Design a protein that fits this description.
heterodimer; A: 511 residues; mainly beta; ligand-binding face of the semaphorins, domain 2; 7-stranded mixed β-sheet; 4-stranded antiparallel β-sheet; 4 helices; 36 strands; B: 478 residues; Methylamine Dehydrogenase, Chain H; 2 domains; 5-stranded antiparallel β-sheet; 5 helices; binds a molecule of 4 linked components (NAG-NAG-BMA-MAN); binds a molecule of 3 linked components (NAG-NAG-BMA); binds 2-acetamido-2-deoxy-beta-D-glucopyranose; Plexin A, isoform A (chain A); MIP07328p (chain B); chemorepellent activity (chain B); differentiation (chain B); glycoprotein (chain B)
């Protein structure tokens, strides 16, 4: 195939994938393995991370009167620090340990920490991104981590569910700011910890706030039947107390079959809109848009009935503000009964709660009930497992990965109108991983399946010989120069021709 | 000693000569000689700090600096903490006084002026039992670098602390709590006694900030075939040395939406500690608790409740008031008042929520009407001290001045501890049945046996306690 450029097949099962934004090097974290590659998927280094003797009943220092056995080391976190050139990789062994490796050569270990940081399960989620935070005012970055309670060890209670963690050499991976009664940390209470689990899907930072996209039970008490919802966890980055820990539910609702709720989110991607799309959402082109793929789920299991939903962060911030304003006006219950018993919202004299509200002592851990709602621009007959968005062309194109191994491209012209223009298999029979990232120019996209990584070209207009094929492909990247017989984008044609119909799009004209 | 009704008095220290009273924006040093103010220390919340309090949804009467923790440090320094309009602060006054340190007090001092909290300054260290959050949903027991598990309901489930005692290298905490102990709990309230070692230094590694010795036991203040439980503890007393037995006296009441009733119970200090030696429901002080195992510390954090309940002295309440209009609220004891026969009786003072003080003793008549020993309550007097509706918050006894200080929200009143001098009639002196008052027959005066000297073989003095009150009167001739 000519659309797929490089293919790298690995020996183990792959877990994560990131691209260095300035050097374009590729880092792949997998089971018992850890690989570094060049921008063309040429292997540079490979690191054996397992297996090692380990039991879930034991920590590194003590092993109760239980035997350590060789167990696999599933990679759970893969991150790059920009200020200090060093790679962060966390494994499942030893209660979720992180190592700090050199960026030029991942084989080198620079710092080994013993702190329990990450889920020690093979399937329990863990989401980690680096963004501004305390202790100092936001000149130092921290690691925001969200971990699911694996429920397999007594040492697991020690690990928070959401926490900020320091990147200082002296205090590596410790909670960033902690005091007697408060800190940069949220635990799930002893009564809900073993029953109410939280699945962390995606994490991102946008406009002085840290975000987590989660799936979880709507209710903690057993008074109601089990319903799974998608939530959005937020914290102010200046906040060194998590006074601003807040959640609102996320609904992706459809007209079809009466009421259809795509309750289970599968993957998320934060990106920028196009000229046309920014007008529909009522935002500037420099603003952020959240792209996410939701799947209707039988219980907690996603079905083959997915949908693509977009959310602007102006409406996300205005929905958080809507839930916060309402609590501080005394209406309703604070929520988040699975942290501590839910007490009523207090009436407050607060007069200037805005989008930047950063939290106070009162109504502090707030659980919003008013959801942010969106109607999907596209629906699909397969389970969608990844999402990525680029606006190199004048239009936004969303790249979507299939659990069956297919890559689909959707072009989004409005909050209402969008449709597929391409669809092909990258690794047939192999679910596409959630970590799917572009090249630095957004010209190639890295698609990772179970055991392979494929460098896929974002557009190829040269393979359209005749012109009815160029405009017929309905590719937003492809137009047709009148003079030369080449299909190519606008920049490739020469406006030397007198007629403005030198380059024509697939919907603006006829060839 | 009268103040407004708006302030809220809390005895923060008491001697037989002086008492310290924390109030709305001041703390008083008051002489027990005439309930006269001797010294004062004012400490007002700043206008910005108390505008923040009203901003967060509180009222004017809540946004004040209610002084609620006092402790004289071993160097002559003075530790003084206040609520500071739901922003608790602690200060260090050094000598009069001058401010030497000011710092946050979250976890060291309540936010609300309610009688919800307690503390004990034991061996130069403050043990605090309060809330650490503005919203009042994070109860803890805190010492220097050691606290209970945040939001762990198996250790503390919405508690109201009533007292704290230092004893034998432990610190005991008395409180009522929500019941999650029984698998079929339904918003029931039970009363606990908790314990922490004073030489606790935290567990190893991550446990280094939490107690390795916190254990609690239920208190049993029940009434036979038809049991009757008083499950909400209201007030305790200091440890009372009644002969060879150390005792703690407590007031209990029934829950709301139940048969209204109050009781007084007493628990041996040895019975309290012995309960921590039995089974756990599904603690020894080691020199370095940081040497314990993760297995051991995690165990005690998952089994903080003992199985056995602390039994009561005589196995029943010493006084009961069921289906009456008023409820008992405070307790104080004058121990070991030697009667005319030479028997020692503890005299018990319990105040009601409508301003009365009940005085009584207990007599353990051996086989008076059956083969099982029968305990009887002898009520000496139940008089009105405070105006008809005002709740008695605390009681402080001064055996020296023969005075009983009654503490309400905005006043202190003193009454006589023993009324021997006041009565002049023979019937009254014997009907009173106070173990300390007896009628002389040479002198017509009803005399106080603390200052008098009987000799066991003289028919001079006359006293009747075991009989009925009318039977005591028949002993009076003519
Ligand atoms: C603290 O101590 C007090 C007193 O020591 C204690 O009160 C006692 O409680 C028990 C049970 O709560 C009472 O025992 C009852 O005795 C009668 C016989 O008179 C039994 O019939 C009772 O029930 C049994 O048999 C029933 C037959 O219908 C069955 O339905 C039932 O299942 C039982 O098999 C029961 O045994 C006892 O009378 C009181 N004693 C007094 C003096 O009140 C209190 O329970 C203690 N508290 C704690 C927390 O330990
Ligand atoms: C409440 O006020 C009273 C009276 O002002 C205080 O009592 C006084 O306290 C001081 C300081 O402890 C006593 O001075 C000391 O006297 C002893 C005895 O000689 C001496 O050894 C010390 O070096 C020091 O000088 C003073 O005597 C005492 N006065 C009386 C009449 O008792 C009381 O301390 C105040 N309350 C509190 C809690 O401090
Ligand atoms: C622990 O590792 C050793 C290798 O040093 C291995 O031989 C042994 O089998 C492991 N333990 C168990 C219980 O298998
Ligand atoms: C990278 O690190 C490994 C292990 O220390 C070493 O063998 C290798 O020589 C280093 N450099 C390169 C270019 O591989
Ligand atoms: C983890 O997930 C994989 C794929 O869904 C499954 O094959 C495996 O059995 C799971 N392991 C556990 C312990 O559930």
């Amino acid at each position: 195939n000519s659309t797929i450029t490089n293919v790298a097949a690995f020996d183990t099962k792959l877990n994560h994938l990131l691209v260095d934004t300035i050097t374009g090097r590729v880092f792949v974290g997998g089971v018992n393995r850890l690989y570094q590659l060049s921008p063309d998927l040429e292997l540079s280094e490979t690191v054996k991370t397992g297996p090692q003797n380990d039991s879930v009943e034991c920590s590194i220092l003590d092993c109760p009167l239980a035997v350590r056995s060789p167990t696999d080391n599933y990679n759970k976190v893969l991150l790059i620090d920009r200020a200090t050139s060093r790679l962060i990789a966390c494994g499942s062994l030893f209660q979720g340990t992180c190592t700090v490796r050199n960026l030029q050569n991942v084989s080198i270990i620079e710092h080994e920490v013993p702190d329990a940081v990450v889920a020690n399960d093979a399937n329990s989620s863990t989401v980690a991104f680096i963004a501004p935070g305390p202790p100092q005012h936001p000149v130092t970055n921290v690691m925001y981590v969200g971990v699911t309670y694996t429920n397999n060890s007594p040492y697991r209670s020690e690990i928070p569910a959401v926490a900020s963690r320091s990147l200082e050499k002296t205090k590596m991976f410790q909670i960033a700011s902690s005091a007697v009664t408060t800190g940069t940390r949220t635990f799930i209470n002893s009564y809900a910890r073993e029953t109410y689990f939280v699945n962390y899907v995606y994490g991102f930072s946008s406009e002085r706030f840290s975000y987590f996209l989660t799936t979880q039970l709507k209710h903690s008490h057993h008074s109601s039947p089990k319903e799974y919802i998608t939530k959005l966890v937020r914290i102010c980055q200046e906040d060194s107390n998590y006074y601003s820990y807040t959640e609102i539910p996320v609904e992706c609702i459809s007209d079809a079959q009466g009421g259809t709720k795509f309750n289970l989110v599968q993957a998320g991607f934060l990106g920028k809109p196009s000229s046309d799309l920014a007008q529909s959402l009522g935002i500037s082109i420099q603003d952020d848009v959240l792209f996410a793929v939701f799947s209707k789920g039988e219980g907690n299991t996603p079905t083959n009935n997915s949908a693509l939903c977009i959310y602007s962060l102006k409406s996300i911030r205005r929905k958080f503000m809507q839930n916060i304003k309402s609590c501080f006006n005394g209406s309703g219950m604070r929520g988040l009964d699975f942290i501590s018993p839910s007490m009523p919202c207090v009436l407050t004299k607060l007069q200037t709660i805005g989008e930047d509200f950063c939290g106070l002592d009162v109504n502090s851990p707030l659980g919003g009930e008013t959801p942010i709602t969106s109607v999907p621009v596209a629906m699909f007959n397969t389970k969608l497992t990844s999402v990525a968005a680029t606006s190199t062309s004048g239009y936004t194109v969303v790249f979507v990965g299939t659990s069956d191994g297919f890559l689909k491209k959707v072009v989004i012209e409005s909050s209402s109108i969008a449709n597929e223009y391409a669809s092909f298999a990258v690794d047939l029979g192999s679910e596409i991983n959630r970590d799917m990232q572009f090249d630095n120019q957004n010209l190639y996209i890295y698609v990772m399946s179970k055991t392979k990584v494929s460098k896929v070209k974002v557009f190829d207009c040269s393979d359209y010989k005749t012109c009815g094929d160029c405009l017929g492909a309905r590719d937003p990247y492809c137009g047709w120069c009148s003079l030369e017989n080449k299909c190519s984008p606008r920049s490739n044609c020469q406006d030397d021709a007198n007629d403005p119909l030198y380059w024509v799009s697939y919907k603006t004209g006829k060839c | 000693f009268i103040g407004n009704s708006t302030d809220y008095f809390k005895i923060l220290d008491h001697n037989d000569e002086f008492v310290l009273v924390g109030a709305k924006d001041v703390i008083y040093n008051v002489s027990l000689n005439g309930l006269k103010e001797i010294a004062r220390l004012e400490w007002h919340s700043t206008d910005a700090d108390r505008e923040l309090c009203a901003l967060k949804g509180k009222h004017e009467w809540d946004c004040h600096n209610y002084l609620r923790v006092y402790a004289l440090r071993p160097n002559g320094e003075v530790l003084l903490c206040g609520t500071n309009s739901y922003k608790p602060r602690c200060r260090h006054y050094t000598p009069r006084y001058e401010v030497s340190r000011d710092v946050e007090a979250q976890g060291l001092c309540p936010y609300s002026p309610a009688h919800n909290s307690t503390y004990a300054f034991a061996d130069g260290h403050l043990y605090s039992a309060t809330v650490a959050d503005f919203s009042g949903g994070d109860p803890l027991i805190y010492r220097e670098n050691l606290r209970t598990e945040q939001y762990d309901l198996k250790q503390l489930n919405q508690p109201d602390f009533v007292g704290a005692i230092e004893r034998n290298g432990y610190v005991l905490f008395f409180f009522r709590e929500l019941s999650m102990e029984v698998m079929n709990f339904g918003k029931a309230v039970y009363s606990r006694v908790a314990r922490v070692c004073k030489n606790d230094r935290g567990g190893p590694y991550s446990h280094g900030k939490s107690w390795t010795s916190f254990l609690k036991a239920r208190l049993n203040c029940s009434v036979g075939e038809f049991p009757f439980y008083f499950d909400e503890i209201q007030a305790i007393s200091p440890i009372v040395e009644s002969g060879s037995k150390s005792l703690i006296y407590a007031v209990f009441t029934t829950s709301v939406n139940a048969i209204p009733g109050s009781a007084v119970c007493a628990f041996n200090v040895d019975d309290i500690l012995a309960a921590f030696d039995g089974e756990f429901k599904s603690g020894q002080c080691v020199e370095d608790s940081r040497t314990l195992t993760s297995i051991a510390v995690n165990f005690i954090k998952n089994h903080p409740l003992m199985e056995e309940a602390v039994p009561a002295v005589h196995g029943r309440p010493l006084l009961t008031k069921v289906n009456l209009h008023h409820r008992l609220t405070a307790i104080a004891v004058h121990p070991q008042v030697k009667s005319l026969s030479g028997a020692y009786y503890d005299v018990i003072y319990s105040g009601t929520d409508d301003g009365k003080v009940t005085k009584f003793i207990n007599i353990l008549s051996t086989h008076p009407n059956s083969t099982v020993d029968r305990l009887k309550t002898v009520v000496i007097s139940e008089m009105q001290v405070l105006p008809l509706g005002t709740p008695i918050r605390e009681l402080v006894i001064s055996t020296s001045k023969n005075s009983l200080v009654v503490v309400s929200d905005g006043s202190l009143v003193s009454v006589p501890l023993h009324h021997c001098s006041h009565i002049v009639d023979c019937l009254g002196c014997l009907s009173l049945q106070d173990p300390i008052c007896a009628w002389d027959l040479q002198t017509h005066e009803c005399k106080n046996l603390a200052t008098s000297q009987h000799k066991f073989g003289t028919k001079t003095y006359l006293q009747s306690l075991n009989s009925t009150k009318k039977a005591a009167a028949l002993l009076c001739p003519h």
